[PDB]
């Protein structure tokens, strides 16, 4: 019989059908709940005098935030927990090892009105 024509001197590995996994049993069998939800990303507010100066002057809430949370999670959870639209989030890591978040709210909401609704003033 005739052989297959090859226009290249290189021989490559042929393409093989690669199946997907169909396991007989589940890996962990109970999916974990939300590791980092809204109640875990927001621990407590900071109520020092420097922070309390910001809540009428800058319209900025100050929260202590878990170290695993980023600005998207902070913004989403502030919107979910307090039903407030936020303008921006600026975070830092304090020298004691915790994380502090300055959340500046939109102009429609008043952080002074929201702080004593939460329960601190």
């Amino acid at each position: 019989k005739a052989l297959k024509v090859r226009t290249s001197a290189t021989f490559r590995l042929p393409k093989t059908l690669k199946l997907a996994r169909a396991p007989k049993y589940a890996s962990k069998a109970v999916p974990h709940y939300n590791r980092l939800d809204s109640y875990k990303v927001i621990e407590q507010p900071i109520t020092s005098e420097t922070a309390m100066k910001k809540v009428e002057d800058g319209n900025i809430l100050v929260f202590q935030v878990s170290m695993k949370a980023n600005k998207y999670q902070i913004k989403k959870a502030v919107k979910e927990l307090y039903e407030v639209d936020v303008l921006k989030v600026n975070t830092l890591v304090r020298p004691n090892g915790t994380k502090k978040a300055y959340v500046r709210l939109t102009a429609d909401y008043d952080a002074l009105d929201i702080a004593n609704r939460i329960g601190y003033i």
């Binding site: 007989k24 049993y25 589940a26 890996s27 962990k28 069998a29 109970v30 109640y39 927001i42 621990e43 407590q44 507010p45 109520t47 939460i118 329960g119 601190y120």
Partner: protein
Amino acid sequence: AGVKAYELRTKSKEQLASQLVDLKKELAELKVQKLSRPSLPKIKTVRKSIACVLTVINEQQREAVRQLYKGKKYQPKDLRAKKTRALRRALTKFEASQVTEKQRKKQIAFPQRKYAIKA
């Protein structure tokens, strides 16, 4: 005080989830009061109640998965037994009691007799 596990066990999973989120709301409301008050020992009861609710939810889900995988080989590894790595790798009782048919014929023909010696 707190919640009791035996009375938590009679509820469904949605009621347990709702009780969990009200417990978390209460924990946040106590944490915002801890900074103003000197001492607040009521936080520990809410924390242990949250732990109790999570334990009951996890045990309900795990028992449901056990009954889903009931009566078949290849159940998940965290559901099957733990004991030790060596005891899991050891031969089962059937494989250890496997004997050749030649030895079985010899054992049936000549077993160890029971005998006594005085008369």
